Design an enzyme around this catalytic site. Structure first.
Site, PDB file in Angstrom:
ATOM      1  N   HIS A   1      -3.491  18.823  17.292  1.00 11.22           N
ATOM      2  CA  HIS A   1      -2.682  19.629  18.202  1.00 11.22           C
ATOM      3  C   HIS A   1      -1.676  18.818  19.009  1.00 11.22           C
ATOM      4  O   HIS A   1      -0.592  19.307  19.336  1.00 11.22           O
ATOM      5  CB  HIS A   1      -3.563  20.480  19.118  1.00 11.22           C
ATOM      6  CG  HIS A   1      -4.059  21.737  18.472  1.00 11.22           C
ATOM      7  ND1 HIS A   1      -3.597  22.986  18.825  1.00 11.22           N
ATOM      8  CD2 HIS A   1      -4.966  21.938  17.485  1.00 11.22           C
ATOM      9  CE1 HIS A   1      -4.200  23.903  18.090  1.00 11.22           C
ATOM     10  NE2 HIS A   1      -5.034  23.293  17.267  1.00 11.22           N
ATOM     11  N   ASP A   2      -2.020  17.580  19.335  1.00  9.76           N
ATOM     12  CA  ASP A   2      -1.042  16.707  19.963  1.00  9.76           C
ATOM     13  C   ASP A   2      -0.043  16.229  18.917  1.00  9.76           C
ATOM     14  O   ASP A   2       1.156  16.437  19.063  1.00  9.76           O
ATOM     15  CB  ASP A   2      -1.719  15.512  20.622  1.00  9.76           C
ATOM     16  CG  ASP A   2      -0.744  14.647  21.380  1.00  9.76           C
ATOM     17  OD1 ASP A   2       0.374  15.134  21.683  1.00  9.76           O
ATOM     18  OD2 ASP A   2      -1.090  13.484  21.676  1.00  9.76           O
TER      19      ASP A   2
ATOM     20  N   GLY B   1       5.220  14.046  18.834  1.00 10.00           N
ATOM     21  CA  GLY B   1       4.102  13.807  17.937  1.00 10.00           C
ATOM     22  C   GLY B   1       2.836  13.340  18.631  1.00 10.00           C
ATOM     23  O   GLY B   1       2.411  13.918  19.627  1.00 10.00           O
TER      24      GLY B   1
ATOM     25  N   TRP C   1      -6.102  17.584   2.388  1.00  7.48           N
ATOM     26  CA  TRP C   1      -6.895  16.424   2.787  1.00  7.48           C
ATOM     27  C   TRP C   1      -7.304  16.471   4.255  1.00  7.48           C
ATOM     28  O   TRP C   1      -8.448  16.167   4.599  1.00  7.48           O
ATOM     29  CB  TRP C   1      -6.117  15.132   2.515  1.00  7.48           C
ATOM     30  CG  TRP C   1      -5.811  14.917   1.067  1.00  7.48           C
ATOM     31  CD1 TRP C   1      -6.356  15.582   0.014  1.00  7.48           C
ATOM     32  CD2 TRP C   1      -4.888  13.971   0.509  1.00  7.48           C
ATOM     33  NE1 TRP C   1      -5.834  15.116  -1.166  1.00  7.48           N
ATOM     34  CE2 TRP C   1      -4.927  14.125  -0.892  1.00  7.48           C
ATOM     35  CE3 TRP C   1      -4.029  13.013   1.056  1.00  7.48           C
ATOM     36  CZ2 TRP C   1      -4.149  13.350  -1.755  1.00  7.48           C
ATOM     37  CZ3 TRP C   1      -3.248  12.245   0.196  1.00  7.48           C
ATOM     38  CH2 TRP C   1      -3.314  12.421  -1.193  1.00  7.48           C
TER      39      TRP C   1
ATOM     40  N   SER D   1     -14.643  20.798   7.831  1.00 10.47           N
ATOM     41  CA  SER D   1     -16.028  20.543   7.450  1.00 10.47           C
ATOM     42  C   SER D   1     -16.870  20.077   8.644  1.00 10.47           C
ATOM     43  O   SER D   1     -18.071  19.925   8.547  1.00 10.47           O
ATOM     44  CB  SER D   1     -16.091  19.527   6.313  1.00 10.47           C
ATOM     45  OG  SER D   1     -17.240  18.705   6.427  1.00 10.47           O
TER      46      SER D   1
ATOM     47  N   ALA E   1     -15.152  27.819  15.282  1.00 12.63           N
ATOM     48  CA  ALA E   1     -14.093  28.600  15.932  1.00 12.63           C
ATOM     49  C   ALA E   1     -14.581  29.344  17.183  1.00 12.63           C
ATOM     50  O   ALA E   1     -15.638  29.984  17.164  1.00 12.63           O
ATOM     51  CB  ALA E   1     -13.474  29.585  14.940  1.00 12.63           C
TER      52      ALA E   1
ATOM     53  N   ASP F   1     -18.094  26.005   7.973  1.00 17.43           N
ATOM     54  CA  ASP F   1     -19.024  25.947   6.848  1.00 17.43           C
ATOM     55  C   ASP F   1     -20.449  25.680   7.310  1.00 17.43           C
ATOM     56  O   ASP F   1     -20.690  25.469   8.495  1.00 17.43           O
ATOM     57  CB  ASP F   1     -18.589  24.924   5.796  1.00 17.43           C
ATOM     58  CG  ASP F   1     -18.499  23.522   6.343  1.00 17.43           C
ATOM     59  OD1 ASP F   1     -19.014  23.262   7.449  1.00 17.43           O
ATOM     60  OD2 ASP F   1     -17.921  22.659   5.655  1.00 17.43           O
TER      61      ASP F   1
END
Ligand code: HEM
Ligand SMILES: [Ca+2]
Ligand SMILES: [Ca+2]
Length: 329
Positions: free
Chosen positions: A47-48, A60, A164, A170, A174, A187
């Site tokens: 997010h950053d 960025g 990737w 994994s 949420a 998952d």
């Protein structure tokens, strides 16, 4: 070179990260665990960093989403991130480390705590964020495949690199997709960095786990698991489908691709010619736990084969009866 605490490293300038390492493991990571805080601190790296575009601007991986919380935590795409931000901000304030340097470091240390995890190249030296990230820079789980790829691409990522990086899902849950059910993992093994994500999202959806009608959510194959609309589609879109499938039961590739694609992301807006290599400080990860499998009560017939050139790798399935996934503590 020899740091004060006797611990050793290649560049002596990296000795500043040792006590920082110990503090995050104790006081942010619950005692170095692959739990809630690691997951959200890893999400924070994205997010950053993704706040970056040749066209619209953004610094960025600059630490802006912390130094400019009030602006950036108010991004719709940044919903629910204010937690880890407020959780991390004390350390950045406390320690001799820039905001951008702290986020990528924490994410890298977090992943090293997860079984099956990999050591991520970490560079020290990111200068302080100079302005807030612009909006429309973090993709959302209801954006189309094309919008998502174009967005990552604009930031510097090929379709294959997107897949990737989504190995992060994994070790991921949420909170705001379906707010009726927070801590619901992507998952069945959010504590273990493995291929169960790429496997279980290829499964044919069966149910909505919380409430029926949430933006950016589609049916999931498992009670206790949530499937993003974006993940659902990327796993079935010809641009990304075969690569997605290649992560299945392919741990070394998962680790290797993720390690390199993360260093790149932790470098968006940065020049590593002007940064110091402190990669040898990132802890050794625990070994992988368990094998790749279909969930209990599943067969190959429950997989929606999306790769045109290669069929889905035949795996075994957990025995006993079908079950439900515990939410993230
Ligand atoms: C490429 C498009 C992506 C989309 C559309 C997307 C979407 C999401 C959403 C909606 C959540 C749950 C947020 C909530 O609680 O409501 C999430 C969680 C997460 N994401 Fe992504 N994401 C993307 C890429 C990435 C990338 C590149 C990373 C790299 C680190 C990442 C790492 C994570 C992690 C670790 C979590 C778990 C949060 C937690 O359990 O605390 N994601 N993602
Ligand atoms: Ca930014
Ligand atoms: Ca997993």
């Amino acid at each position: 070179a020899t740091c004060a605490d006797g611990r050793t490293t290649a560049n002596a300038a990296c000795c500043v990260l040792f006590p920082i390492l110990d503090d995050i493991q104790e006081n942010l990571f619950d005692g170095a665990q692959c739990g809630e805080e690691v997951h959200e601190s890893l999400r924070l790296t994205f997010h950053d960093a993704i706040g970056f575009s040749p066209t619209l601007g953004g610094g960025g991986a600059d630490g802006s989403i912390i130094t400019f919380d009030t602006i950036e935590t108010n991004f719709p795409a940044n919903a629910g991130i204010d937690e880890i931000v407020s959780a991390q901000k004390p350390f950045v304030a406390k320690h001799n480390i820039s905001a951008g340097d702290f986020i990528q470091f924490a994410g890298a240390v977090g992943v090293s705590n997860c079984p099956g995890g990999v050591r991520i190249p970490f560079f020290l030296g990111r200068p302080d964020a100079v302005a807030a990230s612009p909006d429309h820079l973090v993709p959302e789980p209801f954006d189309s495949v094309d919008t998502i790829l174009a967005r990552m691409g604009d930031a510097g990522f090929s379709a294959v690199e997107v897949v990737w990086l989504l190995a992060s899902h994994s070790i991921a849950a949420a909170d705001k997709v379906d707010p009726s059910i927070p801590g619901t993992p992507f998952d069945s093994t959010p504590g273990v960095f493995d291929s169960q994500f790429f496997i279980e999202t290829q499964l044919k959806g069966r149910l909505f786990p919380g409430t029926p009608d949430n933006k950016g959510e589609v049916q999931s194959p498992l009670q206790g698991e949530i499937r993003l609309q974006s993940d659902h589609l990327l796993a079935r879109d010809p641009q990304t489908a075969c690569e997605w499938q290649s992560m299945v039961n392919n741990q070394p590739k998962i680790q290797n691709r993720f390690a390199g694609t993360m260093s790149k992301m932790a470098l968006l807006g940065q020049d590593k010619s002007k940064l110091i290599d402190c990669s040898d400080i990132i802890p050794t990860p625990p070994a992988l736990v368990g094998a790749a499998h279909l969930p209990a009560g599943f067969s190959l017939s429950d997989v929606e084969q999306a790769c045109a050139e290669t069929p889905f790798p035949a795996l075994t399935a957990d025995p006993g009866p079908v079950t439900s996934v515990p939410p993230v503590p």
